Amino acid sequence: DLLKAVRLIKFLYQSNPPPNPEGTRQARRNRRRRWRERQRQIHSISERILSTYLG
């Protein structure tokens, strides 16, 4: 049922670029910040799909 939803969250994992050695020391900090922001939203969506489907 959510075996495609876990593939969607694995695509959110697949939206991760490499941490860019070819990346300025200010810029891959921004990659890390948008990473942690997007998995904050992903954790909110994860507890959404955990709590809502249990009913």
Partner: protein, 147 residues
Amino acid sequence: NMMAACDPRHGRYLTVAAVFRGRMSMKEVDEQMLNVQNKNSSYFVEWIPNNVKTAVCDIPPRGLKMSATFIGNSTAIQELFKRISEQFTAMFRRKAFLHWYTGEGMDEMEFTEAESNMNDLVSEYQQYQDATADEQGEFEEEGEEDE
């Protein structure tokens, strides 16, 4: 004073050396060298971490007995190479100025490979001016596991 397109901001120097044939000790010179070394972050590249030299002689060059000069690795030469290469390609696209550069032996492969290796040196130079692979640009400064 530096005889190039001056840009300390666009500077990642690799090996600097200034011969001090002015008769004075090198302790204050090395202290000021450390001050110039650490006061700006553009010089921080950290390959061969003793990439300086202080050679002192006592033979004067001219009637001004105590003086010095500047020699030092140049990294703002990328804009010089571009300023020459793109105005070579400015007068190459329309087969410009083949009045007598049509030589005794002429090919298109020689000019094409000339500009391709010019591109492959300026692009590798700008890849080495970027991609901070010693300061903090690795994956192991922020722990080890960040997916």
